From a paper:
Significantly, homologues of MIF have been described in many parasitic species including Plasmodium, Leishmania, Brugia, Clostridium, and Eimeria, and it has been implied that these proteins facilitate the manipulation of the host immune response during infection. Herein, we produced recombinant histidine-tagged Toxoplasma gondii MIF (TgMIF), a 12-kDa protein that lacks oxidoreductase activity but exhibits tautomerase activity with a specific activity of 19.3 μmol/min/mg that cannot be inhibited by the human MIF inhibitor ISO-1.
The crystal structure of the TgMIF homotrimer has been determined to 1.82 Å, and although it has close structural homology with mammalian MIFs, it has critical differences in the tautomerase active site that account for the different inhibitor sensitivity. Crystals formed in space group H3(2) and x-ray diffraction data were collected at the Diamond Light Source. TgMIF forms a crystallographic trimer, and each monomer consists of a four-stranded mixed β-sheet and two α-helices stacked against a β-sheet. The topology of the TgMIF trimer (a ring with a central pore, coincident with the molecular 3-fold axis) is conserved with HsMIF as seen in superimposition images. As a result, the α1 helix in TgMIF is longer than in HsMIF, extending from Pro13 to Leu31. Third, the central pore of the TgMIF trimer is narrower than that of mammalian MIFs with a minimum pore diameter of 3.5 Å at Arg61. Moreover, three sulfate ions were bound to positively charged residues lining the pore, notably Arg61 and Lys2, as well as a network of water molecules. However, replacement of Asn97 for Thr98 in the TgMIF tautomerase active site is of importance as this substitution prevents the formation of a hydrogen bond between MIF and the substrate molecule, l-DOPA methyl ester.
Author numbering:
A (entry chain A), B (entry chain A), C (entry chain A): 1 to 114
């Protein structure tokens, strides 16, 4: 699985480390996949707006080979939004999380597809 | 809806503010969705190449729950490309815009899916 | 086609230039599409983790209008992973490459869809 967080907040690598540790656990747990297959990252964007406001907001992209369902997506979004609020100060209601189901052939690690 | 612009141009936050204001309006207008649900951002990439040239270029990703159609995508791309040209100096013919239709269950705000 | 590489490595623009030249050629070759239509970029992320480790890793997103298949994806991933290893020092087995097939109507260049 993959989880990438995009946010204008200038997070210190130590905020980022704690956030990403929370993120990887939540994604592995919800999808029932080994942590060894979970990739997570933080990317500081330039400016971001949401609802016509420059107030802090975030968006996160999560992808998996299967496991993408209404219930599981909601679980992941709840956990990820809460972690961003905790670590970045971004209100959870200003965080969009979107989910993408990938076919095994659409996902490679090194020189091999799944 | 979501619109994220990726470009190597070192845009000043004030270029970015004006760009993103143009972007949010164009996306809301084309999709007939309230501005309150529109998220927009700018991300300065490292190097980008297009057509084998390092000349300035950009790519933008736009996602929505429904509303993704040939006519509507063309309208959004016309408006977004033009805004990047105006605010960033990037020729519109060196801007790729790609569109993604999301199911409601694939999109969360805070701890709730749509 | 589009290929975007996300990695925490602080690559010098000259590492980036060489990487992206390798990337554009490999994508054009595998998909049998003209270089004129290939867009490539590098984005230095903040922190990234993979498998519960902060050791260097990367993820790359590749999109095309058609041409996305198990064999072709594997070819592209092999070439891209190898280039990142060569130019960035990131072990190829710590690189995820994911593939997205786009409809022509979902892809615009300037003010026109494909």
């Amino acid at each position: 699985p993959k989880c990438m967080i995009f946010c204008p907040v200038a997070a210190t690598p130590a905020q980022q480390d704690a956030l990403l540790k929370d993120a990887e656990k939540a994604v592995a747990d919800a999808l029932g996949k080994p942590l060894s297959y979970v990739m997570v990252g933080y990317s500081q964007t330039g400016q971001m707006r949401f609802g016509g406001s420059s107030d802090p907001c975030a968006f996160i992209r999560v992808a998996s080979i299967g496991g993408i369902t209404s219930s599981t997506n909601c679980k992941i979004a709840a956990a990820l939004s809460a972690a961003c609020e905790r670590h970045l100060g971004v209100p959870k209601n200003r965080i969009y999380t979107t989910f993408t189901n990938k076919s095994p052939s659409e996902w490679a690690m090194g020189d091999r597809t799944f």
